[PDB]
């Protein structure tokens, strides 16, 4: 070949001998813990913290940064590469957030790869089982195909809300939490479309095209409030803390949990749907993993920052009242769907829908509202959405 075949210093006898003579017989320092100076959240430093913390090169005028001086190149007009103007919230140290699941990139894709491959094995077996035969065909073709299909656009919109978050946020552990949350949302949307494409291979004449779902998401009054909220969270604001709080802690925790768990997953287990719970098992696992990290960032840290907690709760309570109102409206439009399903006692009658709403709002009060000092009357919100039943 035209170029030299390079000899390896590890195995070539001549180069290995030269390298051995140059390596000292002793270590030149004894501190072998990578970025030993990171303050650990837990008993000892974790690999997650070692590989993540202080990758972002913030100067000392962004709270917590170790560097100094102005950025080397800014936007036309002077917008800094990163800056305090990106959010209303304040803190003594932006690096303080920890994902309780301690996900750096490798455990995250390791876990999702398990779900990727197992899903395909499950579908091949489900097709061989002929288990589709017991699914109520009205639930299948009317509610599942059309209205579950339309929910993918709520997940997709929440996914896209993170684009500006991924650019604007101010530390490395926060950036990882946000991007992993974003991929899980777009994963949810693709998984819903995967279920529909799967049913299309088993049931002839089942139309898995997105045309009807997109039409319903954009023009069916059942999704009118949901779409309005998602369009506002995504494209109406750029405060990156507002987007994460509004998207995950208010909208997805109320409307999103009701739609995924209380309607589609729960009622699948009254109309004999053995396929849909396999997919909602994933979206609900993704919701709980994301919540752990959202909780740490906002509830554990920012709402209790030694200097700015009360300051921060002021904005969080304001955001919450505005977006909870949008989400209550969204649920009021959505519960109209119950008019299209078979009345089952304790499930799709007024008492069952009221108990489901009491679960979503009662959980939300314990998980989020009580912890930031937000005062909410669960009963009053349940009554407000039942108005649309």
């Amino acid at each position: 070949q035209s170029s030299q075949v390079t000899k390896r210093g590890l195995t070539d006898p001549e180069r290995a001998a030269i390298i051995a003579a140059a390596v000292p017989d002793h270590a030149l320092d004894t501190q072998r813990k990578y970025h030993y100076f990171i303050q650990p959240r837990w008993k000892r430093l974790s690999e997650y913290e070692q590989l993540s913390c202080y990758a972002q090169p913030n100067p000392d005028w962004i709270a917590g940064g170790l560097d100094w001086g102005d950025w080397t190149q800014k936007f036309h007009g002077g917008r800094p590469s990163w800056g305090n103007e990106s959010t209303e919230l304040r803190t003594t140290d932006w690096y303080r957030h920890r994902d309780p699941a301690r996900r750096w990139h490798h455990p995250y894709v390791k876990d999702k790869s398990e779900e990727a491959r197992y899903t395909q094995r499950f579908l091949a077996a489900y097709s061989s089982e002929g288990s589709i035969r017991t699914i109520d065909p009205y639930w299948r073709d009317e509610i599942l195909n059309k209205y579950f299909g339309a929910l993918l656009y709520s997940e997709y919109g929440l996914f896209n809300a993170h684009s500006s978050v991924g650019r604007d946020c101010l530390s490395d552990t926060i950036r990882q939490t946000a991007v992993f949350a974003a991929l899980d949302k777009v994963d949810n949307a693709q998984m819903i479309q995967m279920e529909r494409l799967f049913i299309a291979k088993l049931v002839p004449g089942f139309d898995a095209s997105t045309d009807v779902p997109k039409k319903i998401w954009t023009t069916d009054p059942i999704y009118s409030g949901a779409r309005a909220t998602v369009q506002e969270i995504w494209q109406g604001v750029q405060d990156w803390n507002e987007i994460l709080w509004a998207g995950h802690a208010v909208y997805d925790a109320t409307f999103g949990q009701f739609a995924r768990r209380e309607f589609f997953q729960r009622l699948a287990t009254v109309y004999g749907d053995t396929l849909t719970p396999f997919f909602t098992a994933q979206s609900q696992t993704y919701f709980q993993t994301t919540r752990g990290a959202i909780d740490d960032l906002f509830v554990y840290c920012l709402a209790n920052d030694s200097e700015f907690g009360a300051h921060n709760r002021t904005f969080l309570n304001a955001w919450t009242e505005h977006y909870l109102a949008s989400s209550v409206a969204a649920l009021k439009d959505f519960v109209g769907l119950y008019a299209k399903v078979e009345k089952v006692a304790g499930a799709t009658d007024r008492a069952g829908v009221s108990e489901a709403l009491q679960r979503v709002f009662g959980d939300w009060k314990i998980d989020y509202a009580d912890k930031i000092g937000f005062r909410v009357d669960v009963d009053q919100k349940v009554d407000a959405v039942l108005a649309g039943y």
Binding site: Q1, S2, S3, V5, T6, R8
Partner: protein, 136 residues
């Protein structure tokens, strides 16, 4: 042939002879090339693909291909395009092998590269401008 060698042309010169041509006036603007460069990371799967796909059927259908050994990776340059069918590689290796598995050890592309079906293509064509991308 040898116009695609790593050390082709000016690269063979040393000392002042290299400098003179490196600074020649005609070499101060880029020169359009119809080549593509493909870099494959060395591994059990890749070394089999190199010897039994690229250097047999591949070079039979594109004699311009040059493969050079760069210790940790294979450096490949050819006129026009290089194509690798992951389905053929799976038959060779005796194990499941999608186009996404092939990409585990495809390390660089100087050219327009894309995936369609089981096939990985790197081409000098301006995909999306001169020729549209398609679905399955």
């Amino acid at each position: 042939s040898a116009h695609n060698a790593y050390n082709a042309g000016i690269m063979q010169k040393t000392g002042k002879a290299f400098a003179d041509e490196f600074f020649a006036e005609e070499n101060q603007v880029v020169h359009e090339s119809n080549a593509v460069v493909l870099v494959l990371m060395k591994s059990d799967e890749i070394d089999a693909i190199i010897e039994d796909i690229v250097l047999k059927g591949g070079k039979a259908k594109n004699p311009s291909i040059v493969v050079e050994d760069k210790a940790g990776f294979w450096w490949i340059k050819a006129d026009g395009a290089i194509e690798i069918d992951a389905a053929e590689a799976g038959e060779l290796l005796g194990k499941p092998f999608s186009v996404y598995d092939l990409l585990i050890n495809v390390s660089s592309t100087v050219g327009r590269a894309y995936t369609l079906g089981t096939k990985f293509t790197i081409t000098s064509e301006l995909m999306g401008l001169d020729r549209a991308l398609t679905d399955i």
